[PDB]
Design a binder for this molecule. Structure first.
Ligand SMILES: *[C@@H]1O[C@H](CO)[C@@H](O[C@@H]2O[C@H](CO)[C@@H](O)[C@H](O)[C@H]2NC(C)=O)[C@H](O)[C@H]1NC(C)=O
Ligand SMILES: *[C@@H]1O[C@H](CO)[C@@H](O[C@@H]2O[C@H](CO)[C@@H](O)[C@H](O)[C@H]2NC(C)=O)[C@H](O)[C@H]1NC(C)=O
Ligand SMILES: *[C@@H]1O[C@H](CO)[C@@H](O[C@@H]2O[C@H](CO)[C@@H](O)[C@H](O)[C@H]2NC(C)=O)[C@H](O)[C@H]1NC(C)=O
Ligand code: NAG
Ligand code: NAG
Ligand code: NAG
Ligand code: NAG
Ligand code: NAG
Ligand code: NAG
Ligand code: NAG
Ligand code: NAG
Ligand code: NAG
Lengths: 50, 420, 49, 460, 50
């Protein structure tokens, strides 16, 4: 009876790993539980089409 | 006019001391026509019939004070529960003086219970003060008993709110077991070495054996125990250099009861200033009309501030416990008890003795063993994580860039597939 | 991010029924015209372009 | 087996129906020698409790003990807890102070209350608020104990909530009110729903402070648990008529049906233990003349009847011994100064009688209040967008506002259910910005007479 | 300006209906018109009201 995470966050919060080094999305929700670093990449969002 | 005062198992050097405290309570408290009347009873090892005998003796006595006077009891239950639970029917305040379980501090349950021997949560407060001395962040917790242990964990999380810190590992399980080595290994795999132990004496001896047989008393390790772990077979099986705590004049009994009776006497003679004085009825044969001024008399007893006594300044907190008690900080220097510190409720002072640790030097163990090999996880990102199978056996293809630079690959362990 | 933006619920309700496990699924689908659009960072999309 | 039901009571109940309570009951009787003893008592002093417990344990080694109470002394059950610490006998509590909720039992204790924990009561209250979607609210607690668990459960509930509740921070009382620090603590609440956790002696002072602060308005709601709401008849005059409370005190299911259910659970555990182990009767010999070294058994019903099935009702128990799914009743105080029954709680979900929540707008006499609006509209697509509720979350999407639609069965009938439905659009945004600006309350619903409006023979 | 309704008193502090007028203020800046003898009682009540 609990909203819980999975994936990289599910394996990090469980302590299976030590540190995520990945293109991890900095948002509001994840920083409420963990800390972040200062970003190496600044980029927005756009649409890929054909 | 006449107030009965009840004591249970006054010892044979206290059977006269209790009447002496009754006499001294009538000595300097004015020429008022109130009198006192001492009632002392002695146990037999069945708490059922003794709970019955005590509760109907208090009903026939209509006491205002109920005390607990059991240090020399080898019965490991240590339950003065039923007399306090009977007095809770009329909200009659019971002054415990011996036990240190936080489960007696449940004011939801113990509606009319106060005591002056504050529990091991205050030892965790001492431990947080020692953390503020040594400037530490990551601690390792290990508690067997769950009823006091939830309170100890809650008190410790209340303590960690100031720095907004968190405990590194929680440990709660069934007391009495002998197979705890997997959790000890998972604690060894952590960075810190701060050992916080709150268990029974057999469980403390078990973890001492699992520590001494598994090199856990060497250099870097930070040992920190309390008073249950320095007694009995745990005192027999304790490694040297361990740091425990002790109540200054806590197990002392006669002056303890004398100061408690002085507190009760001046609180009652302050309470006789106020009107609407009710009395306990004869609740043995069918009198369930509860005592009216129960919470009123308890609330008078709550703010009963005192500075006179043998131990010193005695006052009840929001838990109704001894504010700012004296504390000894004991060391096991070559299987010998050596006090190495003192604690007033606001600061720690080490004595002239040296803090000898179970490992190497006398300095503080910087136990934060850093993860020198970081287990790094990532996801398969197409421009960022290029993934190739092994060429022959665990090898890659050492390619160059367009400007003459070998791409620094790594031996990963990626997912073989994405299908469950 | 779209679940918080309730004013973009409808596209969310259009996109909740076709979500893909990995991005390369979306890449292979849009290359073979099994999709029409994808929301992603600009640098990676221009890299793949 | 030897099973006794005792009642120390004052309510006039005869005893012969309790003798009938075993005969046609337990049609599949797998234990053979089951002997019931029904006893009625009058005074609830602990001397008679201990005396008759020892009489019934000496009375052919009774293993089933069931007790209910009409008085309001919770510690008696705690007294029974000590009896449960000694007799090694599973004991059921039914009603009153025997059924009042304590914090934490013992491994040496096997006493089982029939009620709901404070976390379950908080779950029911937040289920009420979830069914009404009043997102702006606050938590007010005192130093009355059992409070950090209460606040912590509410924090973990909001953190694990479908809604994403915009919960204002928790204001906690510290001492007796100076009206200087406590008034500043209370002025920070401009919300509409207040959750109060205190004692009954503190609640009078708190609501008198809110009345003096004017915080007892029609928009200001008050949801309190059963721990503070005491006797149903004894109600102090300083309470708002409309005080929301939740308590499992039911009168549609009386005490006799519930002790019948308890007997069913006892015989279920007895038959299942008989299927597991042969020598079922294992109890303590005697109170008086008690020698030491107690023969502590390992064939008990304490950690054995954790789940049970009876009459289609999943009456399973928790780890501490509390019921998993009890029967809670949502009540409010009416204008007639009585706790008016409103709704009942199901096994997990919740259903109420008044789907449209009644206000009881005259909470006192000094309330000149005329700031509610009745608003009707018709489905027009660029302005009025009407959809169903989300069946996944049982909650509208937060940009929308709810309304009711009087959906009838057919043309021949005249009854209709007011289906609560989500609404967005242009005029919805107009109404939201008006309610932010003009600062009013409102009631939105749909027109079921028909179209916009037309004079049909001097009738609009 | 944003002005709350003007509080007019009858006598010295009664703790019956004077504080009913007093406790309606959740604002910050308040002006006061009274005498110096009344000022001590008003400021003592405002201290008691915090
Ligand atoms: C307190 O008063 C009681 C009488 O109310 C005294 O207790 C009695 O003492 C005598 C002599 O030892 C016994 O024979 C009686 O059986 C006692 N009666 C009881 C139990 O109430 C007592 O002496 C007084 N307090 C002291 C001095 O102990
Ligand atoms: C305590 O528990 C451990 C398991 O957690 C067991 O002992 C070890 O078990 C592991 C495998 O899990 C083996 O690799 C070790 O060699 C075992 N060590 C020893 C010395 O037994 C066993 O259940 C208990 N043994 C102890 C005391 O460690
Ligand atoms: C425990 O308490 C006191 C203080 O620690 C000690 O005994 C008393 O000591 C004081 C002087 O500090 C004397 O005035 C008293 O006469 C002593 N009382 C007795 C009976 O010894 C001693 O440490 C312990 N005594 C006990 C067991 O009460
Ligand atoms: C640690 O314990 C192991 C147990 O096999 C032992 O071999 C080793 O000598 C100990 N460590 C040291 C460095 O003494
Ligand atoms: C006891 O309380 C009652 C309450 O009405 C009061 O009338 C009475 O004066 C009080 N007793 C004294 C002497 O204060
Ligand atoms: C520790 O002991 C002293 C002894 O005088 C006593 O006053 C107090 O309980 C503690 N510390 C102080 C000085 O507060
Ligand atoms: C204990 O004594 C006083 C209070 O009596 C306090 O100010 C002081 O900081 C404390 N000192 C010690 C021994 O930590
Ligand atoms: C109350 O019960 C007692 C037995 O506990 C009995 O002796 C007494 O007569 C009863 N009184 C009445 C009539 O209620
Ligand atoms: C209760 O749970 C147990 C498993 O622990 C299961 O075997 C049993 O069927 C359940 N219900 C009954 C009939 O006791
Ligand atoms: C609750 O009761 C209903 C009706 O008996 C039943 O269908 C459902 O499975 C039960 N489970 C829940 C939702 O708690
Ligand atoms: C009555 O029946 C249908 C189905 O219940 C309902 O949709 C409609 O309102 C009525 N139809 C007519 C006009 O008879
Ligand atoms: C439905 O009811 C209306 C009156 O509201 C009536 O004019 C119409 O004839 C009815 N239709 C049916 C099902 O006969």
């Amino acid at each position: 009876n609990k909203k819980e995470w999975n994936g990289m966050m599910g394996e990090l919060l469980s302590g299976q790993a030590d540190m995520i080094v990945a293109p991890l999305t900095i948002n509001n929700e994840r920083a409420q539980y963990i800390e972040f670093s200062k970003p190496f990449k600044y980029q927005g969002l756009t649409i890929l089409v054909k | 006019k006449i107030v009965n005062i009840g004591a249970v198992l006054s010892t044979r050097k206290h059977e006269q001391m209790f009447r002496e405290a009754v006499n001294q309570a009538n000595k300097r408290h004015g020429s008022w026509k109130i009198q006192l009347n001492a009632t002392s009873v002695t146990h037999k090892p069945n708490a059922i019939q003794m709970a019955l005998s005590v509760c109907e003796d208090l009903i026939s006595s209509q006491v205002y004070a109920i005390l607990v006077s059991h240090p020399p009891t080898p019965n490991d239950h240590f339950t003065p529960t039923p007399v306090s639970y009977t007095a809770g029917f009329y909200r009659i305040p019971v002054l415990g003086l011996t036990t240190r379980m936080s489960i007696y501090s449940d004011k939801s349950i113990h509606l009319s219970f106060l005591r002056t021997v504050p529990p091991y949560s205050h030892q965790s407060s001492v431990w947080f003060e020692m953390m503020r001395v040594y400037n530490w962040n990551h601690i390792i917790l290990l508690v067997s008993d769950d009823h006091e242990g939830r309170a100890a964990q809650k008190r410790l999380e209340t303590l960690l709110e100031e720095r907004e810190s968190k405990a590194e590992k929680v440990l709660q399980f069934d007391p009495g077991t002998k197979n705890v080595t997997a959790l000890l290994m998972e604690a060894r795999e952590l960075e810190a070495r701060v050992i916080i132990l709150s268990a029974s004496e057999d469980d403390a001896a078990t973890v001492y054996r699992a520590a001494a047989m598994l090199n856990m008393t060497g250099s870097g390790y930070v040992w920190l125990v309390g008073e249950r772990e320095i007694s009995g077979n745990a005192l027999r099986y304790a490694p040297d250099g361990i740091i425990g705590l002790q109540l200054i004049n806590g197990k002392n009994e006669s002056a303890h009861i004398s100061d408690a009776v002085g507190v009760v006497a001046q609180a009652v003679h302050e309470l006789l200033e106020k009107e609407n004085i009710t009395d306990p009825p004869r609740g043995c044969v069918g009198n369930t009309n509860i005592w009216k001024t129960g919470p009123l008399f308890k609330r008078v007893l709550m703010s009963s501030k005192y500075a006179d006594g043998v131990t010193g300044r005695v006052e009840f907190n929001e838990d109704g416990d001894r504010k700012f008690a004296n504390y000894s900080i004991m060391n096991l220097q070559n299987r010998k008890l050596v006090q190495v510190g003192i604690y007033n409720g606001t600061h720690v002072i080490p004595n002239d003795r040296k803090i000898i640790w179970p490992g190497g030097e006398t300095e503080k163990p910087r136990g934060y063993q850093m993860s020198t090999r970081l287990k790094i996880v990532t996801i398969h990102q197409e421009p960022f994580v290029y993934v190739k199978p092994t060429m022959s056996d665990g090898t890659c293809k050492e390619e160059f860039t367009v400007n003459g630079d070998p791409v620094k690959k790594v031996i990963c362990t990626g997912p073989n597939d994405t299908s469950p | 991010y779209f679940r918080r933006q309730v004013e973009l619920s409808t596209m969310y309700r259009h996109m909740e029924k076709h979500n893909y496990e990995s991005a390369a699924e979306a890449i292979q689908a849009v290359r073979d015209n099994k999709l029409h659009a994808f929301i992603w960072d600009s640098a990676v999309l221009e890299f793949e372009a | 087996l030897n099973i006794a039901v005792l009642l120390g009571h004052s309510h006039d109940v005869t005893e012969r129906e309790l003798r009938n309570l075993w005969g046609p009951e337990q049609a599949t009787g797998l234990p053979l020698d089951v002997n019931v003893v029904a006893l009625l008592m009058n005074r609830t002093d602990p001397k008679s409790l201990i005396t008759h417990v020892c009489d019934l344990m000496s009375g052919a080694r009774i293993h089933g003990l069931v007790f209910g109470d009409d008085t309001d002394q919770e510690a008696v059950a705690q007294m029974l807890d000590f009896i449960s610490s000694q007799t090694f006998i599973p004991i059921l509590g039914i009603h009153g102070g025997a059924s009042m909720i304590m914090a934490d039992k013992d491994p040496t204790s096997t006493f089982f209350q029939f009620g709901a924990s404070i976390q379950q009561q908080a779950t029911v209250m937040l289920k009420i608020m979830q069914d009404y979607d009043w997102h702006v609210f606050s938590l007010v607690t005192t130093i009355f104990p059992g409070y950090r668990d209460f606040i912590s459960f509410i924090k973990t509930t909001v953190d694990n909530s479908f809604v994403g509740w915009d919960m204002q921070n928790v204001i906690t009382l510290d001492t007796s009110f100076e009206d200087a620090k406590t008034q500043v603590q209370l002025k920070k609440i401009h919300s509409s729903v207040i959750l109060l956790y205190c004692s009954k002696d503190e609640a009078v002072l708190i609501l008198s402070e809110a009345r003096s602060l004017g915080l007892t308005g029609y928009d200001f709601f008050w949801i309190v648990p059963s721990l503070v709401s005491g006797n149903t008849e004894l109600i102090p005059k300083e309470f708002p008529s409309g005080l929301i409370s939740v308590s499992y005190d039911d009168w549609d299911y009386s005490l006799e049906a519930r002790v019948r259910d308890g007997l069913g659970i006892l015989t279920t555990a007895a038959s299942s233990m008989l299927e597991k182990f042969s020598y079922i009767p294992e109890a303590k010999a005697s109170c008086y003349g008690q020698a030491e070294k107690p023969e502590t058994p390992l064939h008990t019903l304490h950690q054995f009847m954790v789940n049970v099935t009876w009459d289609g009702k999943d009456l399973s128990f928790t780890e501490e011994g509390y019921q998993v799914h009890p029967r809670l009743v949502v009540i409010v105080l009416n204008k007639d100064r009585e706790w008016e029954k409103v709704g009942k709680w199901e096994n997990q979900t919740l259903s109420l009688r008044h789907a449209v929540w009644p206000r009881y707008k005259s909470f006192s006499d000094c309330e000149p209040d005329d700031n509610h609006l009745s608003i009707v509209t018709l489905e027009e697509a660029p302005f009025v967008i009407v959809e169903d509720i989300d069946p996944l979350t049982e909650t509208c999407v937060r940009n929308t506002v709810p309304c009711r639609k009087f959906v009838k069965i057919n043309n021949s009938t005249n009854e209709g259910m007011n289906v609560k439905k989500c609404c967005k659009g242009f005029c919805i945004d107009i109404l939201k910005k008006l309610s932010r600006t003009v600062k009013f309350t409102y009631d939105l619903y749909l027109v079921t007479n028909g179209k916009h409006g037309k004079k049909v023979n001097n009738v609009w």
